[PDB]
């Protein structure tokens, strides 16, 4: 498949022991495709609480998400881990399930050299033979990739693109110009309109689980040149994003899904549950925007 | 004169002793208006090497720049200084010359509280009675202004707007929505197109001294919805900006102006002159983009 | 046991598949106690490449290290993980082996609230019933703990102390004064002398695997008031530390151990092996300091 | 006069219009020497609100402070400015008054290259022919100086030392070792004891205006090896520093001086006066430590 389009970063519901609720996960995956009308799922990303999970649980999430959607739906599997053996194990498993591409966060925590980071990507690709999307998230990792470093990664024919999240539209424009044939998917929901006019091929986001229909309008209207209409929809989307961030984003998004009849469970500790102090303000937002 | 529009941040040529060359300053001012077709000048900003000047030289720059241009040209006087007495003296001086508004950088160096910063603006206004534009440049000052802080400043009727430079389009969008009737001029030339679609009322920029005609097209095309054409001109403009940044932006911009026959002098020490190692690369840029 | 003293942060040797070499691990543990004359081991810390390992491998490292040392040797088990279920599983396993205390890195990657971080610690303690040492490493995690936050943690009778690494001797002094009866172990080998005079109870370090005898002299001489002698030994130790950092610290420390006849193996990918370009310079250092 | 020793960073009292109160400035200078028993004054530093003053006021402060004290008192004149012409004028002026050395903050605000910073120092020296002390204060300037950069500066015979404030005792130790014959004066009052054991030749500090007698004991006791006693006085001194920092350090220090009957005036706007909400807490501190 052409991997352009809009993707939900799949949220995962848990029980009080931090185990995956598979029936709720199935519902969330179906919500993103059937109700939010998205093109695909980005599975076991940050938004899925992936870095709090064990290896068997990550496989559970990949299996369930793949079983919950039709064959037209695009699937990207985030397999990055500080344990390269585990990234490779996950990448094979996701590839064999039929995921269209793998993705991996830049190695973090330790002050890896860029050559070490480069060869992490190359090693995953060698072992899996699948296409790879760089997951660049300096806000969480503290790792920043320069254009020269992007050029060295993109020189590999199987590094087909990037999930781009640095709040830097100068660097985004330089990448877009230097690599016209690579895939760039923006990961900053609150700046989708600016990404869109900067030539991104689509976007991956946690908030698209609840606001995917407005997001598709932002994208489509901006590309049409109906720029005032698209920005108004960005203003509305940012009211939502700002609100859910103030309340704790992943649990609050899951509370929005619960309101729709989904068995949305709990976050995985050490994330705490949605605080009920925020309930009235969340209710007003859901009403105001028909969420 | 409502102050929407495109402004050159006026560059200043010095002699070997760091004194102002009034003739070249006049030629730079005229170039911005006549040749680059800009709406106005932002005078004694960062780009004017203002923070390296003495008081008498800052007054000199204000007088020369205003004498150089006709009465239809919009003029904003940057008068911020760590010396509040100096800021007020300069503010009265520029106000008496007939500058259309004042602007002031946030106090920097010392860890001032927000109340101290707020009351610096309020004291400048009380003493000058001119309208005031906040100059927000965290990349240089390390001072960041939150939405709640902007709300407090903008609650003052004579704080009419902001020269906004933080590389944050979420904050920009929140400001635009919260203050639909304040003036927002963006100060990041390399992200003019994203600023424009985010609803800015114009822009102030050092590179507009050499590339103001493309900048006008970006701003006009984007607001008309010809977003792909506007973005292509951003790509071209970003080749120029990236190149001059790599060579030393203020001296390199003055060297491009010297190519047009302007007496562009030298930077003020401790800035060094343009390094002739860059000459070949500069000539290729000038030829490629007809600068 | 009283947990005061000097500890090696245990290094782990791997094969090319990233599996633990148990015979080499045994040798490294014996090196730290018998040759370097240290008081204990800090097991599965950052220096042991812990965050690159799977759960079964972490258990392997705990088992082997415990089997390699006598009953007088103090053992601290680092069990922090982003997976709380795994931290608890490891904490029980290490407790049942007889480790004297558990330790856990502050949760990282996600922007956890402090209440979330607090209850991660409290949850581990509830499940394991062992004493707990906070592992504060802002250089790697980006998480900073304030004195007020330290006070809330130390209010728990089973949080007995901290492995302190923030490069902040004002905060260290405030903690030392506010909590005279808690255990403070410094983790910055290059500032051991300053830690010692700031009243730390001991120190944990990767470089003590090769330089533990000088480190004990720094500590003992500084406490005696032989401050010039202790600082001279810090100058010598910092030549070593600076050198090994420039070459890649964990592999280079392991190459020093290899020189002693230890089966020191390889780092775990994505860490690369020691580069042989550095061999001559490493040889000169080993000679100069008898390592 | 070799310039080792303990210096007050001289505080300046202003009237309501931000003009210097020469009588109170004299009383502050005399207090530092007579009552606090210090070796010298560091004049027109950050603590003197120097960066808020005009040129004529900076000269005024130099003249008043030197007239206030006897010829045995060591005097260092801070003359750094973003205006290099001003720095040279002030340097010549202080040199003619008989100041024992000059000092200068690293140029800040603009992103100057290291060559530009290096040649600012060299140009001040060439024009003044006085000895020069680097004022390194990254907390305020955002400029950090590496060991290799220090090597280049110290290769100049008239750069005799540094006022060192970076919170980095590894760098301090490397500098002390590499340059055994340069003057290193530390500028972090709250870490005087750690500086002293790291081999500094003295210290410059704003809190020594009120607590110089304890500071002398810390410095002397630590160099004698009575490290526990020196550290207890650091604990006491840090109660004072933490308290004044929380209240607004320069106005709060002047308020402590007003308690001794000194005409301590006001801070220069945009600094606000001491907030009387803090009065009770300040009085308790003054009583507890006999300030």
Residue numbers in the entry:
A (entry chain A), B (entry chain B), C (entry chain A), D (entry chain B): 3 to 293
Q: From the publication, what sentences describe this entry?
A:
N-Acetyl neuraminic acid lyase (NAL) is a Class I aldolase that catalyses the reversible aldol reaction between pyruvate and N-acetyl mannosamine (ManNAc) to give N-acetyl neuraminic acid (Neu5Ac). The catalysis of reactions involving fluoropyruvate as donor by N-acetyl neuraminic acid lyase (NAL) variants was investigated. Despite a report that it is not a substrate, fluoropyruvate is a viable donor. A combination of mutagenesis, structural biology and computational chemistry has revealed insights into its catalytic mechanism.
The crystal structure of S. aureus NAL in complex with fluoropyruvate was determined, assisting rationalisation of the stereochemical outcome of C–C bond formation. The crystal structure of S. aureus NAL in complex with fluoropyruvate reveals the presence of a (Z)-configured enamine. The formation of a Z-configured enamine was observed, which presents only one face to aldehyde substrates. Reaction of this face of the (Z)-enamine intermediate would necessarily lead to the formation of 3R-configured products. The (3R)-selectivity of NAL catalysed reactions may be rationalised in terms of selective reaction of this (Z)-configured enamine via the face that is presented to aldehyde substrates. Previous studies have shown that an analogue of DHOB – (2R,3S)-2,3-trihydroxy-4-oxo-N,N-dipropyl butanamide – can bind to the E192N variant of E. coli NAL in two distinct conformations.15 Aldehyde substrates may react via conformations that allow protonation by the general acid Y137.10 The facial selectivity of the reaction of the aldehyde determines the configuration of the product – (3R,4R) or (3R,4S) – obtained. Wild-type NAL catalysed the reaction between fluoropyruvate and ManNAc, albeit much less efficiently than with pyruvate as donor. Under kinetic control, the wild-type enzyme catalysed the reaction between fluoropyruvate and N-acetyl mannosamine to give a 90 : 10 ratio of the (3R,4R)- and (3S,4R)-configured products; after extended reaction times, equilibration occurred to give a 30 : 70 mixture of these products.
